[PDB]
Amino acid sequence: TSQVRQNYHQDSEAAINRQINLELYASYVYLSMSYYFDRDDVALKNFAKYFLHQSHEEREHAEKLMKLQNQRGGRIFLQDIKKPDCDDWESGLNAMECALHLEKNVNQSLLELHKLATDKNDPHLCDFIETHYLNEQVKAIKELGDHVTNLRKMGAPESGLAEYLFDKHTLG
Amino acid sequence: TSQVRQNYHQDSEAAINRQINLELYASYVYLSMSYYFDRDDVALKNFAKYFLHQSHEEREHAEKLMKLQNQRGGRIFLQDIKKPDCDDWESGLNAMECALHLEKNVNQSLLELHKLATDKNDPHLCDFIETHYLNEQVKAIKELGDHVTNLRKMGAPESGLAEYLFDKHTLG
Amino acid sequence: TSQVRQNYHQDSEAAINRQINLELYASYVYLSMSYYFDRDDVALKNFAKYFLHQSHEEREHAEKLMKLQNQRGGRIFLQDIKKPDCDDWESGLNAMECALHLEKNVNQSLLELHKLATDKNDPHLCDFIETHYLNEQVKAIKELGDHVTNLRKMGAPESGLAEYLFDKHTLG
Amino acid sequence: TSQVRQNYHQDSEAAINRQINLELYASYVYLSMSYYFDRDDVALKNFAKYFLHQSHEEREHAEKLMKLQNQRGGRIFLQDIKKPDCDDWESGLNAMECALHLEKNVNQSLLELHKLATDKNDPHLCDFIETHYLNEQVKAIKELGDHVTNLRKMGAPESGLAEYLFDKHTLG
Numbered sequence: 158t159s160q161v162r163q164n165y166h167q168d169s170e171a172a173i174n175r176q177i178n179l180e181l182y183a184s185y186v187y188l189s190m191s192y193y194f195d196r197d198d199v200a201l202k203n204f205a206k207y208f209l210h211q212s213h214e215e216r217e218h219a220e221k222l223m224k225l226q227n228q229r230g231g232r233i234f235l236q237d238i239k240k241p242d243c244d245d246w247e248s249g250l251n252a253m254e255c256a257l258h259l260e261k262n263v264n265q266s267l268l269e270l271h272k273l274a275t276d277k278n279d280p281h282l283c284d285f286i287e288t289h290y291l292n293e294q295v296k297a298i299k300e301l302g303d304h305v306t307n308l309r310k311m312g313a314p315e316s317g318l319a320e321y322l323f324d325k326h327t328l329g
Numbered sequence: 330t331s332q333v334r335q336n337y338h339q340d341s342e343a344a345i346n347r348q349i350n351l352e353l354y355a356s357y358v359y360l361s362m363s364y365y366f367d368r369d370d371v372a373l374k375n376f377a378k379y380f381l382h383q384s385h386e387e388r389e390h391a392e393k394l395m396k397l398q399n400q401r402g403g404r405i406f407l408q409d410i411k412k413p414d415c416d417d418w419e420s421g422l423n424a425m426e427c428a429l430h431l432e433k434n435v436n437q438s439l440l441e442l443h444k445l446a447t448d449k450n451d452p453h454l455c456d457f458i459e460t461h462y463l464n465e466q467v468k469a470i471k472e473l474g475d476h477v478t479n480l481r482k483m484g485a486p487e488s489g490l491a492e493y494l495f496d497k498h499t500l501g
Numbered sequence: 502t503s504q505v506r507q508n509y510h511q512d513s514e515a516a517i518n519r520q521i522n523l524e525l526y527a528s529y530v531y532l533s534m535s536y537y538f539d540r541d542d543v544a545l546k547n548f549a550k551y552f553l554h555q556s557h558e559e560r561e562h563a564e565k566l567m568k569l570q571n572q573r574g575g576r577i578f579l580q581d582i583k584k585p586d587c588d589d590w591e592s593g594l595n596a597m598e599c600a601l602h603l604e605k606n607v608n609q610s611l612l613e614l615h616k617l618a619t620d621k622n623d624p625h626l627c628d629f630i631e632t633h634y635l636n637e638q639v640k641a642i643k644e645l646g647d648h649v650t651n652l653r654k655m656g657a658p659e660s661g662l663a664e665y666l667f668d669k670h671t672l673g
Numbered sequence: 674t675s676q677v678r679q680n681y682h683q684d685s686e687a688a689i690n691r692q693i694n695l696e697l698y699a700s701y702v703y704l705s706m707s708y709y710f711d712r713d714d715v716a717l718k719n720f721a722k723y724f725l726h727q728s729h730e731e732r733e734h735a736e737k738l739m740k741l742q743n744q745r746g747g748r749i750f751l752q753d754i755k756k757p758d759c760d761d762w763e764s765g766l767n768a769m770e771c772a773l774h775l776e777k778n779v780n781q782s783l784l785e786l787h788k789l790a791t792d793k794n795d796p797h798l799c800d801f802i803e804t805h806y807l808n809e810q811v812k813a814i815k816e817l818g819d820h821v822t823n824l825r826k827m828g829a830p831e832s833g834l835a836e837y838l839f840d841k842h843t844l845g
C-alpha cells in the first residue's frame with residue numbers, strides 16, 4: 158500500500174482513472190471542433206479560438222485529476238483517447254449543440270463519481286469534486302445553452318450571416 | 330443555551346474540544362522536533378526551520394477551531410497538552426516518518442469528526458472541516474511522504490551526507 | 502476540391518494526418534511520464550515539471566500541423582490516441598531513455614514525410630518541416646542524450662542520490 | 674561576368690526578371706481594386722484600405738527580387754507592367770475571387786521558379802524563394818479563401834448589407 162493512502166477506496170481510485178480518460182476525451186473533441194472552424198470553407202475564427210481554449214481547459218481538468226490520484230496514493234492507469242464521434246461538425250450551431258451534449262455527459266459522470274465518494278464516506282473526494290468540477294460544469298452547460306439559444310434565434314444554421322455575426326459579437 | 334446556537338449538537342461541541350487538544354498536541358510535537366535539529370550534535374538548520382514552521386501552522390489550526398466553537402455557541406474546554414512520545418528523534422528520516430504518522434492520525438480524527446457532523450446533519454460543520462482541514466491534511470501527508478521517499482532513496486539515515494544534502498536542496 | 506488547394510498531393514495530406522496522430526501520442530507519453538515522477542514513492546518534482554512541459558510542447562507541434570493541413574486545403578482526419586507503452590517508468594534514467602527513443606521515432610517519421618514532400622515536389626511542405634520540426638527534433642534528441650549520459654555517469658538508476666541531485670541541479 | 678556571380682544560371686536570372694514583372698503586375702491589380710471601392714457608388718472604405726495595403730506589399734515583393742538579382746550578379750531587365758484585366762470589379766466578393774485567382778497564379782510561377790532552381794542545383798535561390806515567398810503565398814491564399822467563404826455565406830454579392838457588414842467587422 159502507498160504510505161500516504163488513507164480512506165481512499167479502490168472503487169474511487171478506479172473511478173478517478175475513468176474520469177481522467179473522459180476529460181482527455183473532452184479535450185480531444187474540442188480540439189477537433191476548433192480546427193473545423195479554421196477550414197477555408199468554414200472560416201469562423203472566433204468559434205475556432207473558443208473551442209481551442211475549451212480544449213486546453215479540459216486538459217487542465219485531466220491534469221488536476223492525475224494530481225489528485227497521486228495525492229491520495231492511488232495509481233494512474235491510462236487508456237486510449239477515443240477519436241471524436243464526428244469529423245465534420247456541420248455548422249457553428251451544431252458544434253455548440255454537440256459541446257452541450259458533451260458537457261452534460263461529463264457532468265453525469267462527475268455526479269456518479271460524487272455518489273460513489275458519498276457511498277464510501279470520502280469527504281475529501283466529495284469536496285474535491287464539488288470545489289473544482291461541479292460548478293465549472295454548471296457554468297459551462299449554462300454558457301453553451303445560452304450560445305445555442307442565440308444561434309437558433311438569430312436563424313442558424315441556414316443563415317450564414319447569423320453565424321458570422323455571432324462569431325464577431327459574442328465570441329470575439 | 331447560547332443565543333447564537335443553532336443545529337449544533339452537544340456531541341459535535343465535545344468532538345471540537347477534542348480536536349482543539351489534538352491540534353495543540355501536534356504543535357508541541359513539531360516544536361520538539363524542530364529544536365532536536367538545532368542541537369550542536371545534529372545541526373540541520375533547515376529541518377529545524379521546517380518543523381518550527383509546521384509547529385506554528387498547527388497552533389493556527391487550533392485557534393481556528395476555538396473560533397469555530399464560539400461562532401457556533403459551544404463552549405471551549407481545554408485539557409493538558411501531552412508531551413511528545415520522543416525526546417530524541419534519531420535522524421531527519423525518522424522525524425519525517427514520525428511527522429507522517431502524526432498527520433495521518435490527525436487526519437483520522439478529522440474524518441471521524443466529519444462523520445459525526447454528517448450523522449447530526451450539520452452541513453456548516455461539514456463544510457468547515459472540508460474547507461479548512463481536509464485538503465490541508467492531504468497536502469501535508471503527500472509532502473511528508475515525498476520527503477520520506479527522497480531521504481530513503483538518497484541513503485538516509487546511515488548517510489549523514491544524504492540528510493545534509495536534503496536539508497540544503499529541498500528544505501533550504 | 503478546396504478553393505485554396507495547390508500543389509498538395511493526396512499522399513502528403515494523408516501523411517500529415519498520420520503525423521498529427523504521432524505528435525498527440527508523444528504528448529500523451531510525456532503526460533504519463535510526468536505524473537509518474539509526481540508519485541509519493543518516486544517524488545522527483547523537476548522530472549515531473551520537465552516532462553509536463555515537453556507534453557505541452559508536443560500538443561503545440563500537433564496544433565501547428567492541424568493549422569498546416571487547413572492552410573493547404575487538406576482535411577483533418579483524427580484517430581484514437583494510443584496509451585503509452587508503460588504505466589510504470591522505473592526510474593529517471595529509464596524515462597529519459599524512453600523519451601530519447603520516442604524522439605528518434607518521431608524524427609524518423611518526419612524524415613519520411615520530408616522524403617514524400619521531396620518526391621512530390623512540394624517545396625512549401627519541405628520548408629515547413631525543416632523550419633518548424635527538424636531542428637527542434639535534433640535539439641530535443643541532443644538534450645535527452647546529454648541527460649541520459651549525465652544520469653549514467655552519476656550512477657543511476659541504482660543511485661537514488663544521483664537522480665535526486667540531477668533533478669535539483671539540471672532540471673531545477 | 675559579374676565579379677560576384679557564382680552558381681547562378683542564366684535561366685534562373687531570366688526567370689527572376691519574369692517574376693519581378695509579375696509582382697509589379699500584382700501590385701497594379703490591387704491598386705486598381707482598391708480605388709474601385711473608393712468610388713462614390715461602391716463606397717466600401719475597408720475593402721479599399723485592404724487592397725491598397727496588398728498593393729504596397731506586392732511592390733515590396735518586387736523590390737526584394739530586384740535586390741536578389743543584384744546580390745547574385747544577374748542584371749535586371751524590366752518590361753511593361755500590363756493593365757489589370759478589369760476596370761470594374763463588380764462587388765466585394767468578385768474582387769476577393771479575382772485576388773484569390775491572382776495569388777494562385779503568382780504561386781504557380783513561384784513553384785516553377787523553385788523547380789528551375791532545384792534543376793540547376795541552386796540551394797541559395799531555393800532557400801530565398803522558400804523563406805520569403807512560398808509561405809507568404811500560402812497565407813495570402815488561405816486568407817482570401819476565408820474572405821470569399823464569409824462573403825458567400827453572408828449572402829454576397831446580392832446582399833449589399835453582407836458586404837457592408839463584412840467591410841466593418843472583418844476588414845475594419
Ligand SMILES: [Cl-]
Nearest residue numbers: 162163164165
Ligand atoms: Cl484508511
Ligand SMILES: [Cl-]
Nearest residue numbers: 162163164165
Ligand atoms: Cl485506504
Ligand SMILES: [Cl-]
Nearest residue numbers: 165166167168
Ligand atoms: Cl478499498
Ligand SMILES: [Cl-]
Nearest residue numbers: 170171174234
Ligand atoms: Cl483503473
Ligand SMILES: [Cl-]
Nearest residue numbers: 174175178236
Ligand atoms: Cl477509461
Ligand SMILES: [Cl-]
Nearest residue numbers: 235236237584
Ligand atoms: Cl486502452
Ligand SMILES: [Cl-]
Nearest residue numbers: 236237239581
Ligand atoms: Cl474500445
Ligand SMILES: [Cl-]
Nearest residue numbers: 273275276277
Ligand atoms: Cl458502497
Ligand SMILES: [Cl-]
Nearest residue numbers: 275278279280
Ligand atoms: Cl462522507
Ligand SMILES: [Cl-]
Nearest residue numbers: 289290292293
Ligand atoms: Cl467548480
Ligand SMILES: [Cl-]
Nearest residue numbers: 295296299300
Ligand atoms: Cl453561469
Ligand SMILES: [Cl-]
Nearest residue numbers: 292293295296
Ligand atoms: Cl457561479
Ligand SMILES: [Cl-]
Nearest residue numbers: 303304307327
Ligand atoms: Cl450567448
Ligand SMILES: [Cl-]
Nearest residue numbers: 334335336337
Ligand atoms: Cl436548532
Ligand SMILES: [Cl-]
Nearest residue numbers: 334335336337
Ligand atoms: Cl443547537
Ligand SMILES: [Cl-]
Nearest residue numbers: 337338339340
Ligand atoms: Cl444536542
